[PDB]
Amino acid sequence: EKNFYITTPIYYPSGKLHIGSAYTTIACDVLARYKRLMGYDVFYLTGLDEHGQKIQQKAEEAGITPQAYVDGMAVGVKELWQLLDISYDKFIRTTDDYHEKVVAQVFERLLAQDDIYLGEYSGWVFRDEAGNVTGWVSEESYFLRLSKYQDRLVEFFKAHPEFITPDGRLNEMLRNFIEPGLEDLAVSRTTFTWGVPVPSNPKHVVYVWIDALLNYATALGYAQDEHGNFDKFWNGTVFHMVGKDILRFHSIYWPILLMMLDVKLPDRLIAHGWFVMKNVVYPEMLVERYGLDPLRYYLMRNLPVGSDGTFTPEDYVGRINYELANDLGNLLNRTVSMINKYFDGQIPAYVEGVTEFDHVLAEVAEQSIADFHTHMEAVDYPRALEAVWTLISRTNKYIDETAPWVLAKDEALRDQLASVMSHLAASIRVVAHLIEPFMMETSRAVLTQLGLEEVSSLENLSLADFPADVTVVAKGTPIFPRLNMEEEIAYIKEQMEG
Template sequence: MGRFYITTPIFYVNGDPHLGTAYAVILADAIARWHRLIGDEVRFVTGTDEHGLKIAQSAEAHGVSPQAWVDVTSAQFRRAWDALEVSYDDFIRTTEPRHHRSVQRFLERIHDRGDIYLGTYEGLYCVRCEAYYQPGELEPGELCPVHHVACERMREENYFFALSRYQDRLLEHYERHPEAIWPESRRNEVLRFIEGGLTDISITRTSIDWGVRVPWDSRHVFYVWYDALVNYLTAIGYAEDSAEVAAWWPAAHHLLGKDILRFHAVWWPAMCLAAGIDPPAQLIVTGWLLNEGEKMSKSLANQIDPLGVQRALSADALRHYLVRSSAIGPDWDVSLEALVALYNAELANGFGNLVARVGSLIVQRLGGHVPDAPATPPDELAIAETIEAVRAGWERWRPNDAMDAAIGLVHRLNAYLEATEPWRLAKGSAEAASVLGTAREGARLASVLLSPAIPDGAERARRALGFDEAGPLAWQPGMGGATITKPAPLFPRTDLDAVVGRR
């Protein structure tokens, strides 16, 4: 057992949550749930990024103050994550006083150490990204490479962070800690960028006032990205409690999309070094969710509504699809068709069918009286191998492999029932009790292994089979004695037309 600190990016509140943002928070939630399951003390943090030019413009367009606008839009994210069973321990809002204090303390420390200086910046700026781009990074016509819209040329007095001073130290850090960026392809991308030479970066703005004020110069506010990155320290009390920071930092795992890798893998660790603290332990970098080949985002209006899926099926259906369907790292195409097919195959016909069969057979053959599980499981269920494969999947940042191993146990349990045919065994017989005790305990263990992705369905399955608690991550003999009734369907079969109609 140990401590495990995991974060998502904090999400920009200029629109509703979409499947891309839901993917990040659900994936992080499943990882956090796994670590709680194995006994770790977990800190799981998400939240909303509420400053910057884009927010000020959106508030003005809606005829409200920026604070009023972000109060509404941030609440939408919190409601969405609650509906999707996200078990966050802290929800950071960058407009909170505690965050302002953290940002000011962190960046003032860098200023006092001599790595922030005053200058003038001119460059091409994408308002949607809240980021400057070099000409070589843009598409023809000075278009943003992410949003395909024209960038604006801006010139203003800024404070700069002396990033160029940290080129060698960043290379040394990644040489000593090759695990600090995962997958390796993203680490190589970062190393190539650093080796190409780093330039100092603008970290404040004077053209807007919606942001965290610079404590040594009130004419400036901090540029939204450098405000936002500090949230990872706000969540562990950076401005309030040094003991809490020492307990959780630098053993932080930042889950993020590849489009914000440079901010997290270059700017952020350099700023940590400049502030006198170690960089975060690890960045876990996901690919993009694609819809017909395009990145899913608010501005491109190609989203799948995660709450629409939740209303039409369940939070578990969406969670299982996002955790199960692809490895962390590559881009992958998503669709409602694929989601419905996976739901029917693995939740309705697989796990849901297993629980229904076991519960119904206990009622039919044993009068609803739950039998004990035998001391050891049958070899054909491969219990020890399954647990090890699931554990390895989570530890290696391959939750899809972990879920594959858990679903494999479900398939073997259904095959075990087909082979032993408990419906043919004499009612009340010791043989029927042994077979159904085995299947019931196997279904409990499968529910535990699946619970990081489908927490609600896993709990309902255990209750349907007469278990008061999840129980250990191991085969558990005995545990009979309860009385159950025929279970209701956990995951009723559906089709695409029904899902589209119910959204």
């Protein structure tokens, strides 16, 4: 159906990536996976921002060309995205030929339109003896005419109040940068060579941010021979996920660029806060030890919308223990044991309102599914997952309330025992569906133990809509590890310090 395009920032390859950059790439992966499962036609881009002064310095310290240096880095990044199961449809690098060409043409085009002019870069109280300020950047530089599109950008902001999420960040951009008056922007540099040369004046390289921002267009084939993906996906729904500290580049410079090139503006910028480790933690270490799905769950659940989030060893191990192993794992494990013991693995047909608590569980499942969808559309994963774990929580309660082991010792309550059992399986099926974007492997294994096929859609989900003639596995396997909580905390702290 409808077209949906989601992008990460293209990260600087200036080191080995920590949780920080993993966070955003996993977050966009979750959204892409979800949108696909909701029957959208989806494109998901990530990649690397390879030009710049610092990168060139690194390469010379290493004793190799810039190209070979960034080639070194790109291999490591692709390896990490492989580890974290990132389902990007394309990976873009700014040293890719097709990209560098388009950047050159765009710059030239803008110059021909007088949207870029040639002026003098200048600016920065101590004075000399003639009142001149001593304590100075000074070069020739091209300037982008942001001032000329200020009114038009203000209109855009006012007509699209949900252009940036969460609420408040759009007003911050207005107050701090736009309403006071946009200055024209220096979009070239001359103090280094590692960049896209301005054709008409090769001593200037394009400012890395203009070069970088265009990645979102060029990856689709903008201003190239094969441009089907641009016409499709750029004219559909376009989301850019970014960290708050690069919001001005994406909310001011990028929209105005797109105005000058006469193409559609994106529909949403999702700006998020910082992940802080409490002091560096590498994805591989965590994935090797406890697996991928814990990491993805942890990162997505622990960065709240509108604020920063914090990692601790205690919280990481605690959530695996309580939220995954106990809340979800034991629920599955004991659901499967009881279906075996009482109905020889055959899950009874689903009949609504057999016990007193049935209608209550059903109303909670409907609420959890609706809340999940609301929060996923807003890209609020903590709240999305909270809704999932509300259903888990109420399903564990439902076991306590119906007391299957009491029902089983009375032959007149067989229909009730059966309804408990079908309601447990049905509940866990819904849960395995809701978590799939976050925890693909966990989802599959949960469903396998219930004798169900892996998820294929998230449309039209409900508790009652359960397949007939289902048989659970004869023997259950734990989906999560049983941790030595003190040892694992001490292990994580050891890896961080050492």
